[PDB]
Amino acid sequence: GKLPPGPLPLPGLGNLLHVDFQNTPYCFDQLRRRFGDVFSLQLAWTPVVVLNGLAAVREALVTHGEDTADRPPVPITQILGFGPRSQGVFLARYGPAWREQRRFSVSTLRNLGLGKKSLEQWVTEEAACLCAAFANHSGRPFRPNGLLDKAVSNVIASLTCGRRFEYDDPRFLRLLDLAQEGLKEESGFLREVLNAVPVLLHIPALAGKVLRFQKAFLTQLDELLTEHRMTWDPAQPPRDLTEAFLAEMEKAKGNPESSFNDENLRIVVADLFSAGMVTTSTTLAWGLLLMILHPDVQRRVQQEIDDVIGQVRRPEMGDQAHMPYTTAVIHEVQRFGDIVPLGVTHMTSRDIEVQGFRIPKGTTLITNLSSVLKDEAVWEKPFRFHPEHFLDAQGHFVKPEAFLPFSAGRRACLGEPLARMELFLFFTSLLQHFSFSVPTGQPRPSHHGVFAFLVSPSPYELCAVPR
Ligand code: HEM
Ligand SMILES: CC1(C)SCCN(S(=O)(=O)c2ccc(Oc3ccncc3)cc2)[C@H]1C(=O)NO
Ligand SMILES: [Zn+2]
Ligand SMILES: [Zn+2]
């Protein structure tokens, strides 16, 4: 069939000069408006197809799910112990190694707490610590990002590592620091080159600085894993994912095919931990920013929290069903924050058809989630913070199909169930006991965030006064 349209490619650079990597989301909007919902790009040697809108993304990830569940190979990951039976989950290639960790991560989380009141109470406990930390700032203006990252990170640590860390633990802080730095490494020109030419890694000079943060991250994590291997009580049912993983490694000794091995234990755990320390807290960072930028909405939320929960009892997942306005606000924060605009790259394993065009095997697929979350054809005021995007005239919460912050298909975020719970409990817990606002004498903060693979709100301070 006919391949997707797109800007005319240069001789060797291809379309590298037709894409503004400073604000790619905007550049792609222009391309979408110019060539359509499914267009092509030749980034150097990598053929790319961008998917815009719910339909294009869905036909690829759901309808053609089997053929689009693979990731682009990333040979550089070798530096972290990645191998055929050791791929973690996020960067894992479509196959048994992924499926085994995928199924394991999903079911273990569910067994450990997800969907039960135990996790809720654990989270609201961590929430209480978060509140107390906010209170230490008295009326003084501060940046909530660090405390949000620490509190959220403790929830995933509890699940994976069976413990939390004090907001000032050196190892905890270093772990969080390295995790955020390495999120800068995933976006480097050098990595692209070494990735195309695997052999170039034999030069210690290069290999030695390519993924230094991810390596530091894993190294720092090994120390924690080693202590855990020591405290673990195999005579009791696993308390966390690391123990569950460990018990599987026992059962799997002698099985060359099992992905439950030492190399993969640090990758899987680092996979879940890192993912959990940089997603939800960012959304929460957007949440608090939007709440000081729209005090009215913040009050409506507090009002609902008062009417349904009060200012005593700790929030509970059972409350959400009776808090449609707060649920709408949270969903809008996710929609507007648009924290993962271009999603995570996919790769076709077979030739497929999308919106009439043909997408050859091996094509790097880009799911433009931002275009689904800001689709002017679907949302009323896509470029505005508008809780009514998830509310009907009656005040009922409705979730449109264009709400794909987590993508779709067999590869969709496995942390969604955890994210849903964290956002509700942490958000209501914060607004239930605090009142946020822009610090007098300071300019209204921008609702425009700084572009990256993971989009954070622009730096800002706020005042948190008790209630
Ligand atoms: C509000 C927060 C979050 C957002 C917006 C988000 C978004 C995403 C997106 C866009 C993907 C890619 C889906 C695809 O490949 O098409 C994904 C993947 C993934 N996320 Fe998240 N995520 C969030 C939270 C977390 C959390 C809390 C965890 C849990 C540890 C997590 C774990 C993962 C994992 C393991 C994958 C890879 C799944 C696979 O390839 O099979 N994420 N997420
Ligand atoms: C275990 C690894 C160190 S292996 C090498 C790469 N990373 S990473 O720290 O660079 C990273 C962190 C967050 C991220 O963003 C996410 C995740 C989930 N949902 C939405 C966004 C992407 C990549 C770790 C990894 O695979 N995590 O999943
Ligand atoms: Zn444990
Ligand atoms: Zn209704």
**How far are the Cα atoms of 153, 181, 210, 441, 442 from residue 213, in angstroms, in the given order?**
18, 6, 9, 38, 35
> Cα separation of 402 and 376, whole Å?
11
Residue with tokens 């919902």: 37
**How far are the Cα atoms of 95, 393, 437, 466 from residue 293, in angstroms, in the given order?**
45, 24, 8, 18
Q: At how many Å resolution was this determined?
A: 2.7
Helices (H), 8-95: 24-35, 53-58
Instruction: Give the count of alpha carbons within 13 A of 400, CB side only.
Output: 24
Helix (H) or strand (E) holding 118, with range, is helix 117-135
- Check if the beta carbon of residue 76 is closer than 8 Å to that of residue 416: no
User: Which ligand has its closest atom nearest to the C-alpha of 231?
Assistant: 3
Output b/e per residue, 408-423; b: 16+ Cβ within 10 A.
bbebebbbebbbbbbb
Classified as helix, coil or strand, 311 is coil
Closest among 381, 133, 411, 111 to 238, alpha carbons compared: 111
Helices (H), 136-198: 145-161, 170-185, 189-196
Q: With the C-alpha atoms ordered 83, 158, 100, 233, is the resulting torsion angle positive or negative?
A: positive
| Sheet-wide strand order for 46-52 | 38-43, 46-52, 364-368, 346-347
> Cα separation of 460 and 450, whole Å?
12
**How far are the Cα atoms of 51, 198, 351, 388 from residue 361, in angstroms, in the given order?**
16, 21, 4, 41
In angstroms, what is the span from residue 89 Cα to ligand 3's centroid?
A: 21
Closest among 4, 53, 37, 78 to 363, alpha carbons compared: 4
Specify whether the backbone of 447 is left (phi greater than 0), alpha (psi in -120 to 50) or beta. alpha
Residue with tokens 């009791």: 236
Cβ neighbours of residue 416 closer than 8 Å, sequence gap 6 or more: 406
Pair of tokens at residue 359: 């997408």
Cβ neighbours of residue 43 closer than 8 Å, sequence gap 6 or more: 14, 15, 16, 19
- Check if the beta carbon of residue 435 is closer than 8 Å to that of residue 465: yes
Q: Which CATH number fits domain 1-467: 3.30.420.40, 1.10.630.10, 1.10.600.10, 1.10.10.10?
A: 1.10.630.10
Classified as helix, coil or strand, 355 is coil
Pair of tokens at residue 425: 């409990």
CA angle 241, 245, 249 (to 5 degrees): 170
CA angle 216, 85, 199 (to 5 degrees): 65
Q: CB within 6 Å of ligand 1 — which residues?
A: 89-90, 102, 156, 271-272, 275-276, 279-280, 283, 339-340, 343-344, 346, 367, 405-407, 411-415, 418-419
In angstroms, what is the span from residue 402 Cα to ligand 4's centroid?
A: 19
Count of CB atoms situated within 10 Å of the CB of 268: 25
Closest among 100, 31, 38 to 348, alpha carbons compared: 38
In angstroms, what is the span from residue 232 Cα to ligand 3's centroid?
A: 5
Pair of tokens at residue 348: 């076709």
> Cα separation of 240 and 162, whole Å?
5
> Cα separation of 37 and 371, whole Å?
9
Q: How, if at all, do strands 346-347 and 352-354 pair?
A: unpaired
- Interhelix angle 262-278/241-251, rounded to 10 degrees, is 160
- Check if the beta carbon of residue 161 is closer than 8 Å to that of residue 242: yes
Closest among 7, 52, 58 to 376, alpha carbons compared: 52
> Cα separation of 443 and 455, whole Å?
22
> Cα separation of 262 and 242, whole Å?
11
- Check if the beta carbon of residue 170 is closer than 8 Å to that of residue 176: no
> Cα separation of 311 and 13, whole Å?
60
> Cα separation of 349 and 346, whole Å?
10
Classified as helix, coil or strand, 95 is coil
Rg (CA), the chain: 22
The DSSP secondary structure of 22-37, one letter per residue, reads TSHHHHHHHHHHHH-S
The DSSP secondary structure of 373-423, one letter per residue, reads HS-TTT-SSTTS--GGGGB-TTS-B---TT--TT--STTS-TTHHHHHHHH
Q: Which of 152, 271, 456 to mutate to test the pocket of ligand 2 (most atoms within 8 A of CB)?
A: 271
Q: With the C-alpha atoms ordered 56, 421, 453, 275, is the resulting torsion angle positive or negative?
A: negative
> Cα separation of 180 and 184, whole Å?
7
In angstroms, what is the span from residue 308 Cα to ligand 1's centroid?
A: 31
Q: Which residues pair with 254 in a beta bridge?
A: none
> Cα separation of 232 and 236, whole Å?
9
